[PDB]
Amino acid sequence: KAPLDEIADDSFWSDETLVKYYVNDLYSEISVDGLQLQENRSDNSVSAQRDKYRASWFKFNYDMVSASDPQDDDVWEDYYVKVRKCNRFFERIGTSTIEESEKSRLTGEVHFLRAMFYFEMVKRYGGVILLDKVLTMEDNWEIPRSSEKECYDFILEDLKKATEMLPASYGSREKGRATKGAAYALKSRVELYDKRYEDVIKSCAEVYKLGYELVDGTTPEKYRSIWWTTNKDNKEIIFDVQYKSPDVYNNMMVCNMVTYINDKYGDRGWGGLGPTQELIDAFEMADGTPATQYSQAPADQVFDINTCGIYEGREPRFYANIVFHGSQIFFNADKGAVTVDRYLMDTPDKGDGSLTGYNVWKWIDYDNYNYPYAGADFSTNWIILRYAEIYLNDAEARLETGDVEGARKAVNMIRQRVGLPDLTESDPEKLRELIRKERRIEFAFEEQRFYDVRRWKIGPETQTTLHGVRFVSPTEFKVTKTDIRTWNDRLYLTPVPHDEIVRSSVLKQNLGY
Amino acid sequence: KAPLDEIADDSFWSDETLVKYYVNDLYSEISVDGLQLQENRSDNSVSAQRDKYRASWFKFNYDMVSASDPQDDDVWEDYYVKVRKCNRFFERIGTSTIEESEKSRLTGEVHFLRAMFYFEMVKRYGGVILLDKVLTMEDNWEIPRSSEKECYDFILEDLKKATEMLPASYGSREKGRATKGAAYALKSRVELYDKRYEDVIKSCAEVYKLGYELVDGTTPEKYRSIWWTTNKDNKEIIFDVQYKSPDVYNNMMVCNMVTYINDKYGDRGWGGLGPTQELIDAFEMADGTPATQYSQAPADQVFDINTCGIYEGREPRFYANIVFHGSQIFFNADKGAVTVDRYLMDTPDKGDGSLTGYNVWKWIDYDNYNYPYAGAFSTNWIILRYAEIYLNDAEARLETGDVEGARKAVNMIRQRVGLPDLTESDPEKLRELIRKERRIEFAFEEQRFYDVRRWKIGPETQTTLHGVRFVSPTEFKVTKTDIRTWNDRLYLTPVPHDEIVRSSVLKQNLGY
Ligand SMILES: [Cl-]
Missing domain, CATH: 1.25.40.890 (Serine Threonine Protein Phosphatase 5, Tetratricopeptide repeat)
Incomplete structure (x- = not known):
């Protein structure tokens, strides 16, 4: 302390x-939240601990937080x-x-x-x-x-001083430190969060000059390689931390790893993040066409994974982010690749099994890592700032500024890098949603969705009834309700802890608490 | 981390x-708990924050802790x-x-x-x-x-290794570090908690040889001087920490300082510890005579501070521990001594004013310190004092059947405050006298909670506690200050719920 x-x-x-x-x-x-509680408090995930830690961790999801139980982490x-x-x-x-x-x-x-x-x-x-x-x-x-404005001014004055005093690059030994680029990249997000759009564009322009480059993501393996520890030196990383938690109970990888993979490996994992059917539905086809939507399917409807093509023909970020029924993981582990089974193995009925029928991939190195057996450090390369964000922060600020063509050019850089055809949309209202949708897919499981929902003020639309899948045979599934959430506009801010407020006469609580 | x-x-x-x-x-x-929550969860104190932090800090006092709200600090x-x-x-x-x-x-x-x-x-x-x-x-x-036995074995094996490897003394530069004496002193405490009485006596015998000496406490000022920063080098200190908290909200002194002293100084304090009437009643007269008991007085009864002699003629530890109506504090502060007023100034009705009509003294240096103005304040927290060796010894010696030995040891503590020697020959009666002496000697030193717990006297102590309220500059009434309750599950702190659900093999304590 x-x-x-x-x-x-x-x-x-x-x-x-x-x-x-x-x-x-x-x-x-x-600090890195190994449990990604904010993401599990968003429409991207229903935690495998939804029931186990309901009262402790997920009161937000049902508007049940208070100053006395703030769940502010x-x-x-x-x-x-x-x-x-x-x-x-x-x-x-x-x-x-x-x-x-x-x-x-x-x-x-x-x-x-x-x-x-x-x-x-x-x-x-x-x-x-x-x-x-x-x-x-x-x-x-x-x-x-x-005031929030004063606080954003304080943060931005610190980042202005940082851009003036930091180098653009370091030597071999000092690699990992904050760069001029990291400061400008954080500045653009802080400015976007406070709707300082003319400033975002200027901050982004600076990062474009600092020699960063988007990793080729035309294949799922290629895209996932951004997070590989054996690729920790790629030109897309602006700022990261190699998070290696001391305990198994707080280890980001073990906490979000598939639990029932114990036919070949073990049950060391806790499931963690559970991608929703709503997020799965948002991944486009490889040609930029929308996929079949399953979230609003009747519960008595049975689908065949092979007749319908639920997990077939998707764009690379789908296979890069989602572990689904039939996914092969741990290719370069002893014993080789294990196939994920939602029918017999990782079931919602089992403890710490996925409640949605999905698990996160992305920053979990299922490509290279060996299984974390007990006996004989399983770190995560937590990328706080990636070059992809510069493009999306720029696209967002440009649109709000009236530069629809600049916004289109910027968001299409993100689509081009995963083989997706360019957006053509000229209407600002329609183009805004397309950028917002791209941001969701690009930055899924990167601790942004919760703050995107908050800043865009789309809580009522997202904190509703969320869905998942349940397998009734090795080939067939039903769509399920995974969480019955609700919303209140007070949830656009976290409560200040009660004991802190009662301590000071001048310290005022946030609205609604 | x-x-x-x-x-x-x-x-x-x-x-x-x-x-x-x-x-x-x-x-x-x-770590030092500046708020001394464990003491405020004992019959020695009712916190000035009793109502303010009822549900966050004091659920223990009403048997309202759970695995989900363990209040384990x-x-x-x-x-x-x-x-x-x-x-x-x-x-x-x-x-x-x-x-x-x-x-x-x-x-x-x-x-x-x-x-x-x-x-x-x-x-x-x-x-x-x-x-x-x-x-x-x-x-x-x-x-x-x-098992608890295995854990006490682990602690004691570590302290055995410590006694073997630590020096008895340090040079000027390395003063403050753990000594051979500190290890033996902690050993005697750990052994007493686990009822290893034959071992306590042996550990105490070792500390008696290490050149420690009890500070003369024949006057309140003399006794208080144990905790003075200008006396940090006395022969009674075995192990201490000079605790200077960063924030005003966690500063041990400001948190437990009289709030309404603003006639001469200010309202920077938060009251904190509120000695109970029950504790005030336990302080003997200077001649070892019992004082008048006021806790069970009818609420409609009015007393005169001068006709009755409530705060008159007590033994030195009374004036050394308790700030009451008419107490003078901050003698060597600019502007000089201020007199505490329970009638007009520090009133239960005022925020962070004393709910009992008392505040702690002891380790608050009201003798020497200046007032902590927010213009342009550490506590000498003594974890181990020589006085404890005598009382741990007295306790273990009695349970062992050495009534003559136990009497000899506890009378050392009474002798240093001018109290007459205990004469009691009955083991059952002598037990209570030692326990009574321990309570007075170690009041406001984070022990009472664990003494109640280890002696298993929770039902007797966690009840309705009292205090005083002044109705005039001279007259007062006895008040209820906390309506506490007890359950035997409170003899152990619950393991936090999230920890229990994390592990199949991790089992909760009884009652939670
Ligand atoms: Cl202050």
Whole structure:
């Protein structure tokens, strides 16, 4: 909890190695939700833990959160500690005897990190308490929340300072640090979240000049390779973290891995994310044609996986993201590829089996990894910022600006890279939905859907009755209801924890809580 | 959260400075509850936040905790992280190129710390998951809880190793670190909790030889001086932490400071601990005579602070622990001493005002400190004091049948506050006298909760608690301050629900 300098002697900020270790500690404060609870609080997923952790984790889905049970994932509590560690750096770096150029670059990294930490809070609660110094007894602690606009201004001023102080690239040893590109890329998302469209376009223009390149995704394997640990050096990654959780209970891969693969491997997995029939329906055919829609099918209707072509002829991102009945995974594991069976094996009736009939692929390296048996690190390459987002943030801001042709050109870059034909749509209202739909498919299971629904204000449309599939034979299935969700507009903001509000007279709760 | 070595280069454990920093990080993992929630969950205090944080902090007081709302103070979650950091030290210290003697002492400090971290868990949940290595993907994580006996064995084996490897004393620079005495002192406490009485006596005998000495407490000022920052070098301290919380909302002093002292100073305090009438009633007269008892007084009855002598003629520990109506505090602050007023100023009707008519003194340095103005405040938390050796010894000696020995030991604690010696020869009666002495001596030192739990006296203590309300500058009435209840399941803290559902082999405590 305490900043790193509290462990050392009254000569820490002079030592370049200790100051470099302090910044490493700040990077170590980047948190990854292995359980992807926000995604499971969106129309993209129904958790395999829907029933097991209903009251603990998914009260949002039924508008049952309150200030007393906020289910904020302790972001308010945790992220102010992270911010405190940044503010300390900023307080003590001035007196540092380190070289001006190195001191400047490190300060830039802390600006990027502080911006990133505040953005995690702002995207949830809206306006927060803005702190640029480490509070002491000398300070007044009854500090009100600033406006959301002020908070977005604070984040963006930190990212402006970051773009001015960070390098575009690093040497072999320092690869993984924040770049000029990472700062501009985060800036464009923060600006898009606050509807600063003229600014988004400018930020995107900067990233286009920094030599990033979209990985070829004309095959499912090719697209999935963005997330491969053996491809961690590709030109699409702008900012990432190799997340290797200590415990099996919080390990991002094991938590979202198919459970009943125990005919060849084991039941070490927890199922985790359960892609919905609504998301499956949104994946287009390889030629840019819509697929058959199954979500609104009557429950007594039986389909044959081979007569209907439910999992046949889809665009590469479908096979890249979705583990479905008959999917082959773990090709380069001992014993080779295992075929996923929703009829006999991974069933909703079994504990931690998929309730939707689907599991996530994407950042799970089923292509290269071996099965995580107990005996004899299963990290995830969590890509916080990808080059694909620059195009989609640009497409979104360009449309809202009136540049329909620029928007079309930008979103068609994302479609071109998966062999999808170009969008032709000239109507702004129709083109907006097409961009939004592309964003959903592009960034599925990348912790964005929940904030896209929130910022686009499409909660009533998405938090409804969600569906999945259930197999009645090795070849046949029925469409099922997987979650009966509801909505209230207060859910456009996360409640501030009750104990925090009662602590301060000036601290005000979000509307509806 | 991650061990310190994860931030540095693959040459960390060779560097003596980095290894020394790792152990500093392990010491930094020692947590102090500035709000003293366990004490506020005992018959010694009714928090000024009784109503404000009823459902978040004090569900224990009304048997309303559950596996889903355990109110365990996140000890299970947090302490396994602390233990993980210890186990990594033990895994990687072998490869260290540091001097054998320094390496041995440091390893001893980590044994003491790991024992201390597991004891915080065991004293709450009972049996826990015993881990001596850092779990990896290679390991099976479905590990059941060990028995409470096994857990006490683990803690005590760590403390045995600590006594063998730690020095009795340090130089000026290394003062504050775990000593041989601290390890023996913690051992005696852990042994007493697990009713290993023959062992307690042996552990206490060792501390008596290590040159500790009880501070003279024949005056309230003298007794209070144990917790003075200007007396941090006294011979009574066995193990302590100078706790200086970052925020005003978690600062041990501000949280438990009299709120309405704003006639001379301010309203920066939050009241916090509210000594009960029940505890006030337990403080004897200076001559070892019982005081008048007021807790069961009728509510319509009015008393005069001067005709009755409620706060007059008490033994030094009374004035050393309790801030009551008419108490003078902040003598050596600018503007000088302020007099506490329960009639006009610090009233239960005011927010964060004392609901009992009392506030804690003890470790709040109202003698020396200046008022914490928000212009331009650490507590010396003494985890282990020499006074405990005598009382742990007295306890174990009585249960062993050494009534003469038990009397001798408890009379050491009474002698230092000018109280006459106990004469009681009956073991059953002497038991209660020792338990009574323990309550007064260690009031507001996070022990009462665990004393009630281990002695199994929950029904007797978690009832209707009382306090006072002033109706004039001189007159007061006795009030109900908390209507508590009890259930025997409260003799153990529930294991958090999400932890239980995670594992087939992980079993919940009885009643939850
Ligand atoms: Cl304040």
